[PDB]
Each structure stands twice: as structure tokens, then as C-alpha cells.
Amino acid sequence: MAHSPPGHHSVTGRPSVNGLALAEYVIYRGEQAYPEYLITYQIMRPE
């Protein structure tokens, strides 16, 4: 993995084109996330 930018602990990817998209985030240390829920699902075919 790369390092976080100096003086930072993560990167936030802010959408600048698609007005409906929410943010995405990157961490560079596996210790900064805990997998709290496992969700099992299907995608549903639109009616």
C-alpha cells in the first residue's frame, strides 16, 4: 500500500461531475477499518 498524504490519515474522493454520487474514501492502514456487518443479498430486477 501507498502512504496517506503527509499529515493526513485518509483520502476523501469528492464527486465533482456526478451531482448524485456520494463520497468514496481510502485508508492506507488495514487497522483503520473494522468489518462490523456482513450483509448477504441479491440485486433485484427492476419491474
Added chain:
Amino acid sequence: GTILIDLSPDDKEFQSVEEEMQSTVREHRDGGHAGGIFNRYNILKIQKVCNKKLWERYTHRRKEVSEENHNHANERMLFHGSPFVNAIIHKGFDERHAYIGGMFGAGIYFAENSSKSNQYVYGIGGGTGCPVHKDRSCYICHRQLLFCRVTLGKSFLQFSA
């Protein structure tokens, strides 16, 4: 040391997790190429992931970050889709779970939109789709996502397309 505890659909915790899952679906610029064509999910199961060692690893780092950032971990709940979710729940996140070619460099990626993470369940760009039918839009095969507690600390803001 991981155990998985089923949440009842009657549990308010199940309900708040399902609501975050369903309410953060959006349309994607690929027309559904990577993740499939859908507006909502059929939630089959929500399990709490319990591992004391991995939790303590998380809280140890969280405290280090908080102490570097005026006692503010900047903790979020975010989605993660990966072909290695079953490895992650047993062994924790580490460099093997990083997206080497991601647009913000080689790190571990999370999304506010569940549908964004759904694009990575079968690999980068949806890979070749589900193992059984080779269908990135498979409506039959069971998929899994993680809803994760993530320490952002001081986050570098990248404006991007």
C-alpha cells in the same frame, strides 16, 4: 476467532443497517455494466462480525489517530465490496485487500453508496460476474458486502470526476 451472529429482521439494528444499504443505491455511469441493473436489494441476512483481537486492533489504531487529530477519530460507517470478504472477516483488513490501481493510490477503498461497493463484489469492474453464471447482473446468486466502521482522521480532500 471470528463468530457471526445473525440479526433478526425485527431488530432495530437489522433495520437501520438495511435502510443504509437500500437508501444509498444510485444509478451508475456504466449503465450497470460492473454491478448490474437494479434500484434495490433483497436482503437475505445481516450478521454482526465479532472478533475481539480484530476489534482491539481497530480501537488501538483509532486512539492513535484521535490523539493526532484533537481527539477526533472522524469515524464513519461505510460499505466495502470485495471478492475477499470471507478472508476479511476472519483475518482483518490488510495490504492484500487494497485496490492497487485505485484513483487515489494503492489503499483500501470504501463507499457511502452501497451500489458503488456492489460493483466490486465480483472483482474490479465486476470481473466476470458471478461464479456460476458469469453474469455481472445476476439476480439469482447471493452477494455479500461489508458495512464497516472506518477511522478517517484528518482526511485529504480530492475533488474528482
